[PDB]
Design a protein around this ligand. Structure first.
Ligand SMILES: [Zn+2]
Lengths: 101, 21, 22, 101, 22, 101
């Protein structure tokens, strides 16, 4: 059916809950110095290999997203998600997921 | 019509895509 | 506020509208 | 005397319904290879002369629009509305219609 | 986290506000 | 406690009604040719010294604002708030106040 706004909010809460459960498991058995999972209001980013671009498919639970594309983050070598150069937010590229970019 | 969900897309975009435009 | 609620709905329908380079 | 968002929505749908009338009318008596009319959520773009910029007065039924301005589209020689260079959306300039652009 | 809804109304009043070149 | 959207609207109306008082007062006690106080939907800009940048702390009644930064306007020598170069809107820099800049 055609998805309503409040249905979208509901599925985001379900995804946020799943992210909190996923983050609690990794913190109970850590190893190495990777980028840790975190929720960004849209999707749960997974463990990131230090010094590499991390690609996640545009979440299938977002009706308005292109489910064949990927969203991208940057994980530096110290195991920290990279900031946008010149700003104080985490860098993320969602251009493939949306038509207005 | 269903533009409410699509505009709520725009905001979560705004709050998401942080790379230089 | 209604003048802004209608004008903010301007913003979104702009976003969805003006596709030329900004 | 100031319009509400609900009144604005209703007027949009009426303009949208009349656009379907125009489309249906043109599809019933085609001629040549021009850019076909279409609805873009704001106004009904008319038949476009191929190879020309098409200018439409900023719709009178949009309160927050400057009704002395024009929105612009591009119609290429093949009778197709031009896309934005480097993107997958139809090019359109509404800067004259709003103050925030 | 319903702060988004007040935060998105941030975005609009931003849009209506910050007029300097981006 | 995290404040609601409706509460944010109320505090803005309180600040807007307070700006109208300041504007009505200075109009009764004019002097010189400075930049006059204005309400821009967010804050009430004070009297501006001609030919100077005017810095106002990001108002404390906006929850999502960095209350340690400043918004900026430009007051030209004629006592008029400067427009943005190339546009017909008054220039204002709120980048310090928000994180989405
Ligand atoms: Zn909105």
């Amino acid at each position: 059916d055609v998805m309503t706004k409040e249905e979208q909010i509901f599925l985001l809460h379900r995804a946020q809950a799943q992210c909190e459960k996923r983050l609690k498991e990794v913190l109970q058995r850590p190893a190495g110095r990777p980028c840790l999972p975190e929720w960004d209001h849209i999707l749960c980013w997974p463990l990131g290999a230090p010094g590499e671009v991390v690609a996640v498919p545009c979440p299938d639970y977002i009706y308005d997203f292109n489910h064949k594309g990927h969203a991208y983050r940057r994980c530096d070598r110290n195991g920290s998600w990279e900031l946008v150069p010149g700003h104080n937010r985490t860098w993320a590229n969602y251009s493939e997921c949306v038509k207005f970019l | 019509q269903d533009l409410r969900r699509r505009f709520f897309x725009h905001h979560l975009x705004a709050e998401x895509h942080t790379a230089e435009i």
